[PDB]
């Protein structure tokens, strides 16, 4: 994927 939500 491109873009990781769980990191923010």
């Amino acid at each position: 994927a491109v873009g990781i939500g769980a990191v923010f």
Partner: antibody
Amino acid sequence: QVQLQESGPGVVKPSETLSLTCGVSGGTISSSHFYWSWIRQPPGKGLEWIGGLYINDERINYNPSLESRVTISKDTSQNQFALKLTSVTAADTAVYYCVREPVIAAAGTVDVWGRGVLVTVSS
Amino acid sequence: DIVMTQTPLSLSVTPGEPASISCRSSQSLLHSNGHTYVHWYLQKAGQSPQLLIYEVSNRASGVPDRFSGSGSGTDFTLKISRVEAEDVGVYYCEQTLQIPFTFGGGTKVEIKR
């Protein structure tokens, strides 16, 4: 530029430990804004996310369904991303992928997947 | 865990007509930072998954204009304006909003004859 080169034994005996390596060709594992993941695919059954780590904060996340048995590490010494899985059963027979994901679009507009390595659990 | 539900299980397309695959989440994929963290891949036979679309609608850097993504919230759609022979395989949706990341069950796309 960057290619992920996977390797590991194809056969692991039941109750033993599976170990896979993901070499980083064309870059270093310590680059900022990347998430590193292990995903597996049983023969003909779809994709399961195992775990990953975020470089900027070195937070490591595990899939709770495996969290007891899995160890994921970054290996700066060998420019490698590593997976270790204990007490394997036939249920762990699968194709294993490492993937590098830009956590932000500025870091990249595509991810990178390794070719995938088949691991068979059998005696 | 967020469940991703893909429909249909299988689709048959004659080359050149559009195809449309559906993915629906058990909860919203919108983060408070304003991004929606859902993605589309194609995995061809004996090959590793290939990222087609990230964050609902964006095209990964080597993907033709023929692939497009739409939706919001909980409902997402991948559209292939014209299916070509090279587009056969299994398409997956994935969420990266919360741990663990979860994939849909996959949609097998084959050629009708």
